[PDB]
Structure 1
Amino acid sequence: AKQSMKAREVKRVALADKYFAKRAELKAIISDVNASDEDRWNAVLKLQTLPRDSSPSRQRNRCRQTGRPHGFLRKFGLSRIKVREAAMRGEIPGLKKASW
């Protein structure tokens, strides 16, 4: 509901995509078994501290536009209640129900 939880969340998502995309084999180099006495060291954790403040692991793919805690749906940009409000009003393409 608060603007501070929306403000944290919005900045994390544009910089998670900026910073981690170009640091996706760094993950392999410093954790996964891809190294075997090769690097495994401080010099690449010099770089993984950037995707940290803003990274997928702190971006719960939610509250980047709406002020509803949990039940978010990243595919609409919305949540439980606002998906239902927009269906009621026909503001979504193809929205019907299953009858089979």
Structure 2
Amino acid sequence: MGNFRFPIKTKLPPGFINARILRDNFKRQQFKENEILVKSLKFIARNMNLPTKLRLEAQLKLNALPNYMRSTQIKNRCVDSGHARFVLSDFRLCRYQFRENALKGNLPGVKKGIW
């Protein structure tokens, strides 16, 4: 609607905001909210023992779930910038941005790899 981009009013993340970041964050929140439910639906679907009609219904429900319920849709962005390439998980930062931070001394224990 007009007052918000997505259906649910989620907060903005602190520090660097970006449109893509906003999109990702919301998606992550919705996944967190509807994680157990999705799992339960998946279980009901992939069951040889249960009634077939019920499993079909569960599968249909899973199919009909939105873009923001999907775990696979989540992509690890850089947190300092808003890039989504070469994003290292141990400091949620992009390649160049990580290097910049590392050389400054922002990182907790990172330093030049001399051998």
Pairing of 1:45-84 with structure 2 (within 5 A): 45-46=60-61, 49-50=64-65, 52-54=66-68, 55-63=70-78, 66-84=81-99
Deviations 1:58-80 (A, max 9, x none): 11222566322311123312111
Pairing of 1:5-84 with structure 2 (within 5 A): 5-30=20-45, 32=46, 34-36=47-49, 38=51, 39-42=54-57, 45-46=60-61, 49-50=64-65, 52-54=66-68, 55-63=70-78, 66-84=81-99
Q: TM-score, normalised by structure 2?
A: 0.63
Q: Is the 8 A contact 2:102 2:110 kept in 1?
A: yes
Q: 1:75 to 1:69 in 2, by over 3 A?
A: same
* 2:14 alignment counterpart: none
Q: Is the 8 A contact 2:42 2:59 kept in 1?
A: no
Aligned residues: 94
Ranges in structure 1 where 5+ consecutive residues have no aligned partner? none
Ranges in structure 2 where 5+ consecutive residues have no aligned partner? 1-17
**Given residue 48 of structure 2, which amino acid in structure 1 is its aligned partner?**
A
Distance 1:45 1:63 in 2: 35
Identical aligned pairs, as a percentage? 28
* Higher RCO (C-alpha 8 Å, min separation 6): 1
**Given residue 20 of structure 2, which amino acid in structure 1 is its aligned partner?**
M
Q: 1:21 to 1:43 in 2, by over 3 A?
A: closer
